[PDB]
């Protein structure tokens, strides 16, 4: 196997779609390269590390829509950036899984940095930004969540039984599993950016 | 150690806050309760059906705003069930994680009946409904989960080495870390709220 950075990375994403998040491991990313552990360990010092690594080089693969447009509104990057997020988010098993409890890395910093000063020269102050960008963020990370997990552990339940369902939940079912969840998300999706519309044009009146 | 059901889970929760619900292993659950493993398989066959139970058991427990009061709005009882469940969710190391996946169970039913036929009377269709429904789920799960893991993580990272930081990111994540996130979170629940008014209230016109 070749052991530069890119090979590592290639190789852990291939594994975490056969595997898992559980299943990946050291000793599982060493046989995979056909290495011994040692000289994986050479490369890569531990789990973390490469969770870290990965949660950084998915989104450098896959978020397209991380920037606005020239002269894009404030609702629409959101939209399309959310949109994006969830894409990448979505193109790995247990990929969520792998964003949770990172926070923006180096490479990152300039992208996370404009994304916070362009809702700045929009009227949000950095607080609001901050909150409208997390609360996109946080929504987004839920749904596609319940969504993976749910598919995971539909391999080891008895799966709804139905007869004893009442009505109105056994209807909601059906309906949430129509799709994967993107109408809901995207409904969703909207509500937050309008919420969040009326609350910028408020300024200081009551809303 | 007694061994009905309650006693089970007790314990199962004690070791939740002790190690982690990766660190959640029948083994370790059978030294804890001083047995031999077999014995605690004849009441426990798996960490699926352990998770499950612990999943509805902590709502169970902690999560008292599940119905609205009489004469509440739609807004309100959004807005109360979702701090309700926040701090449900909260009250256990990975108990979000514990949720992840989970639909609801049997002992669930008539609530979560009761929630959906409540939207449907305040003029939401049930598919709106759902989703307002989803929205403030996957909302809040996301706010604790990236918040619980983040702080899991905490203890294995370098941690924010600043200099480089770039100053609006800089400023941000010493607001982000203020509190908990609880601001956060409250700000963003009333945007999604306030969002779903406006879809509600739209009717058949364009907003
Ligand atoms: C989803 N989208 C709003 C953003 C995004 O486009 C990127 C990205 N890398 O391009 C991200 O990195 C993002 O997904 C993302 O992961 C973010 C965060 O993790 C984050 C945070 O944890 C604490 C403070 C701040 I301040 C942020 C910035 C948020 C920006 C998020
Ligand atoms: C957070 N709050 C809106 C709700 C709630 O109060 C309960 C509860 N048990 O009282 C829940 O069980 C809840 O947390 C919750 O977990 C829910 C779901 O998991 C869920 C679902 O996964 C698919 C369809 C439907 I339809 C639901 C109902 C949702 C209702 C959620
Ligand atoms: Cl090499
Ligand atoms: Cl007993
Ligand atoms: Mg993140
Ligand atoms: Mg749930």
Redesign the interface.
Known sequence: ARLNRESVIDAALELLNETGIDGLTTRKLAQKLGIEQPTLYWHVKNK?ALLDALAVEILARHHDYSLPAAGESWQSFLRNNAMSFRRALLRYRDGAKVH?????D?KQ??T??TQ??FM?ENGFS???G???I??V???????V??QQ??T??LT??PA?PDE??????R???Q??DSDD?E???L??L???????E??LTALLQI?
């Open positions: 973390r949770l409890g990172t926070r923006p180096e910093y300039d996370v940095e916070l000063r700045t950095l607080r609001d901050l909150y409208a997390s609360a963020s946080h929504f987004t990370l839920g749904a969540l319940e997990e749910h995971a552990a080891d339940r709804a004893n369902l009442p009505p109105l939940l209807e909601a079912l309906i949430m969840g109408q809901a998300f409904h969703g909207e509500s937050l950016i309008r919420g969040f009326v609350q809303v």
